[PDB]
Amino acid sequence: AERMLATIMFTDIVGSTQHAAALGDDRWRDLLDNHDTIVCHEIQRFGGREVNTAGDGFVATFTSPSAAIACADDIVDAVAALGIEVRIGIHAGEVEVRDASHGTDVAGVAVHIGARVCALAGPSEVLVSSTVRDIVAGSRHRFAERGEQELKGVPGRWRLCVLMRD
Amino acid sequence: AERMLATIMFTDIVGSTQHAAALGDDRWRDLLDNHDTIVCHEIQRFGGREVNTAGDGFVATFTSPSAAIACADDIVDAVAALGIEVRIGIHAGEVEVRDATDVAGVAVHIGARVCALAGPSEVLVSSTVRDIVAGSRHRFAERGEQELKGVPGRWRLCVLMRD
Ligand SMILES: Nc1ncnc2c1ncn2[C@@H]1O[C@H](COP(=O)(O)CP(=O)(O)OP(=O)(O)O)[C@@H](O)[C@H]1O
Ligand SMILES: [Mn+2]
């Protein structure tokens, strides 16, 4: 492995648990396979790379912060077409790449920060660390600043920004 | 090929974020790799089938609730030998079996959730799994009624008593 700079994207179906319960396993299952084939499609489209992909959501790394943001914005719309909303979290940082000619994985506190931003993201909302915003500054993307959302005893403090889509 | 009865095991490292900070990404990565070889080995040992990551953790299905419970208690000890503790959650129910091995259904969400309620080096299970192995050597202590989030009902959770 090597320490590499990367932009990490985390996806999560909103009220996924209530959803499965209000639907039944048969329909829930079908809805899941649709979402996965969709999201996985967008990610690959925008040159992203799926890393370990966990639960009712995904995790992917992009070599371009802009791409990752474009992907996330497109995903939010493509899944809303299924009746379900997704919440997305993005972060960028160096990470240990447990890479492999298959399911190449990643690890480091950067990964935990991403996952943590995803959890704070609202329905059909793309949330990102101020880190992600500063580093694409100069691009067409714009964001609104939420403020400081102290993260699970993580060293320092973090501000989060919502991508203003359209 | 359809709806199947299964015992699902969810594992997760306790305070995996306090450990990475304290270790630094380099060491955290190696450890993580040791843990994964260990857990994955126990699961395979006890005939389990990984429907594999719960991020910093695993998810596996067993055709025998007893086996799954024996795998989980062995795991708790084998990882404590690395300096880190795991929390484990078990549940049993029918589940939708599928593609891209993977499983799905509200039973998976229930498991994933009695894992999050599990303490360090603790094996937590739904009253559902205590009930299905009643008659075996395993014993449990009852926590009471929890309102597992997003879930209908109000479940009773039980702690596996280990030596
Ligand atoms: N196949 C799978 N493998 C591992 N985990 C899975 C999984 N399917 C679902 N999950 C679980 O789904 C849960 C993740 O949190 P969410 O799914 O976002 C519930 P929530 O955070 O309460 O959303 P909500 O507030 O909209 O109800 C985790 O417990 C996760 O491990
Ligand atoms: Mn969810």
Side-chain angles (χ1 to χ4, degrees):
Chain A
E2 299 176 300
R3 195 78 182 307
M4 302 193 331
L5 217 202
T7 305
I8 320 183
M9 186 185 77
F10 287 80
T11 66
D12 190 62
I13 296 179
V14 167
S16 63
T17 275
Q18 288 78 166
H19 266 284
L23 263 251
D25 279 3
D26 192 56
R27 293 190 271 199
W28 170 252
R29 154 204 159 61
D30 272 344
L31 178 42
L32 263 185
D33 290 67
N34 279 344
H35 152 298
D36 292 14
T37 230
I38 278 183
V39 174
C40 183
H41 167 287
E42 289 302 72
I43 286 167
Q44 292 178 42
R45 240 227 301 181
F46 296 73
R49 196 170 186 180
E50 181 157 337
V51 265
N52 76 100
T53 305
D56 54 304
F58 289 71
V59 178
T61 59
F62 297 77
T63 50
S64 160
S66 268
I69 293 173
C71 183
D73 177 82
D74 238 54
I75 290 169
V76 163
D77 282 309
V79 314
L82 284 179
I84 55 179
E85 304 171 63
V86 70
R87 68 175 40 136
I88 308 196
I90 313 191
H91 185 76
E94 297 188 296
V95 296
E96 297 305 327
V97 190
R98 312 162 71 185
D99 139 286
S101 187
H102 70 285
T104 157
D105 206 28
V106 148
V109 39
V111 178
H112 292 180
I113 295 167
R116 181 87 305 77
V117 171
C118 179
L120 285 174
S124 290
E125 146 169 330
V126 174
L127 205 63
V128 306
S129 57
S130 52
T131 305
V132 167
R133 163 199 61 182
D134 309 328
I135 132 185
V136 313
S139 76
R140 69 175 187 300
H141 315 296
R142 298 287 176 279
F143 311 77
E145 216 181 72
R146 285 202 178 304
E148 21 215 41
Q149 307 289 66
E150 28 89 21
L151 291 69
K152 31 182 272 183
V154 197
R157 164 189 287 172
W158 309 71
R159 304 174 299 173
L160 308 177
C161 310
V162 203
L163 181 276
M164 295 285 115
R165 296 154 34 79
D166 89 20
Chain B
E2 178 182 345
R3 199 77 181 307
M4 304 190 318
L5 218 202
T7 305
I8 347 232
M9 181 175 62
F10 284 83
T11 72
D12 184 70
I13 299 183
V14 184
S16 54
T17 253
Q18 180 190 303
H19 287 294
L23 255 21
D25 289 2
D26 182 287
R27 282 181 293 189
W28 170 245
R29 169 233 163 50
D30 281 302
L31 173 49
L32 216 53
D33 277 40
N34 290 136
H35 162 286
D36 285 19
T37 31
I38 279 178
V39 164
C40 173
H41 173 265
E42 288 285 65
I43 281 168
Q44 170 170 156
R45 258 265 326 259
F46 293 76
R49 210 191 208 117
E50 330 113 300
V51 331
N52 244 343
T53 109
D56 277 316
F58 290 71
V59 178
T61 58
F62 296 78
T63 31
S64 163
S66 269
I69 291 171
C71 188
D73 177 80
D74 236 57
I75 288 168
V76 162
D77 272 311
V79 313
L82 295 169
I84 56 180
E85 305 181 63
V86 165
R87 47 144 75 70
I88 304 188
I90 310 191
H91 184 76
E94 296 188 298
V95 295
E96 289 299 309
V97 182
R98 8 160 311 195
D99 95 282
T101 60
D102 199 299
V103 147
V106 53
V108 174
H109 294 197
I110 289 166
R113 196 144 320 192
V114 344
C115 152
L117 290 156
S121 282
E122 170 170 330
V123 174
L124 200 54
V125 309
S126 52
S127 52
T128 299
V129 340
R130 152 192 68 183
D131 293 340
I132 323 267
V133 310
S136 78
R137 70 176 186 299
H138 316 295
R139 298 286 176 281
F140 310 76
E142 216 182 73
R143 286 201 179 305
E145 268 174 298
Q146 241 71 12
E147 303 117 0
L148 265 43
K149 103 83 48 179
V151 182
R154 243 207 215 190
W155 302 60
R156 285 168 324 197
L157 293 150
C158 314
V159 190
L160 172 67
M161 278 166 170
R162 305 155 40 90
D163 305 52

